[PDB]
Design a protein around this ligand. Sequence first.
Ligand SMILES: N[C@@H](Cc1c[nH]c[nH+]1)C(=O)O
Length: 502
Amino acid sequence: DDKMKNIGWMLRQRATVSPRLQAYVEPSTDVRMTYAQMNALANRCADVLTALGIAKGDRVALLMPNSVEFCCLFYGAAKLGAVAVPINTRLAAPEVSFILSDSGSKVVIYGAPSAPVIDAIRAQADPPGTVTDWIGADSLAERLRSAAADEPAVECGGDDNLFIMYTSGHPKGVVHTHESVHSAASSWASTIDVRYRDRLLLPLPMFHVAALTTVIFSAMRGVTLISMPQFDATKVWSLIVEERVCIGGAVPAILNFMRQVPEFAELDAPDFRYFITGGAPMPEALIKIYAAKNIEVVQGYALTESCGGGTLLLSEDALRKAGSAGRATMFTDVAVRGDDGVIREHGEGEVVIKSDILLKEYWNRPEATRDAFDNGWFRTGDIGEIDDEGYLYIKDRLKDMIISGGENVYPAEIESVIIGVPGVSEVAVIGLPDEKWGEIAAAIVVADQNEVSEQQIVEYCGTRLARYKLPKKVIFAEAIPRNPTGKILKTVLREQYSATVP
Ligand SMILES: N[C@@H](Cc1c[nH]c[nH+]1)C(=O)O
């Protein structure tokens, strides 16, 4: 009986071990709920979904702000064997319409901030045809008020589908199961220093895979979620103090802003131990200033396809291994697949993952699914290097890969050669559109133009790189666009140089 492997039943079990432990605290909306209350609201959510015709395998799209309803809808769907489709509320109406059609969502639950997108979608001549119900905030709240908190007969779990999350032309839907979600939650919970009764600040959207995994591992470990649905750097330290927060989810921008507000210098947070951050590596200067406040930083690497698991750079290693994405986590194997097709745990190549945290499939894309795997190893499309001690360094992401005359070219391959040229101080490589090649690799170079010439860089590149990998344009710039935490902004580069191509 797969109920024992059901994420919604897991919540019920946390509500049995620790019924009176705080589960969800959102001071902005005055929500302070125990695990027993959260389980009861999940049951009410399940009752509401049942009432709407949702059965095992049916998709319920979620387009709403962070809230305990978001969590309990997810849990409620889990108990029913339904499949949640959490949608990014920043997407425009055509992208949301695609997702609804592709997922074949039956019910759409939307927040008030998303009413304009839903309105635009429902106004189409032929809206997504599978949607039988569009349920906004007021309707959901009224339904919840009259629902019974009966525990559903839960008879699904394990490898049963649980959610579809879209990742990007058109996105693909990444299908996760009760098993993958549980594995990812276990992976985090067994790898990071998380403790029974820890209080964890979530100030990132719940439609991001890592935030979803955070919600689930919180129930798994008995952690209280402290919710900040709209991040405000001028309000976050107060919240961290008032709610005795132990761990916080963040990204480097957030931690940078949090360092600049008056509260950083002024409030003391003795219970706060570390942030878990996603995104580019944290700058050393930021790691150090947080370390002076006795706060550590955990970093890592994950994808939608890995349910937010993958590698973690533990606190002890943040400075030691600046720029690393860390080591493989519990329940995850991570390696690199060479140009030769050999998978190795040490060296350079395409990052590959083998783990129960992996997606079951891309939704209604069986060939894409097969092509993404090599003997159980998921091919990320990202390139990196694993050092002799097992630390992963990401070199380039799939999103920045260039297809030039049908050949794949990653920018880091070129950047790491050109940065070597004497007189070059910085280099970033992007693809620019091209009638002939589709995209060409353009090197944007900051250099002493008295010492360095375009011809010299290209003829120098011709020394280390196959001919098809040579930059087809070299562009000298006085500056490359970077964010305050020092990440090269390739999206800005592409915008800047759109004026140079037809
Ligand atoms: N080994 C089970 C454990 C589990 C899943 N969900 C809740 N518990 C699985 O991952 O499928």
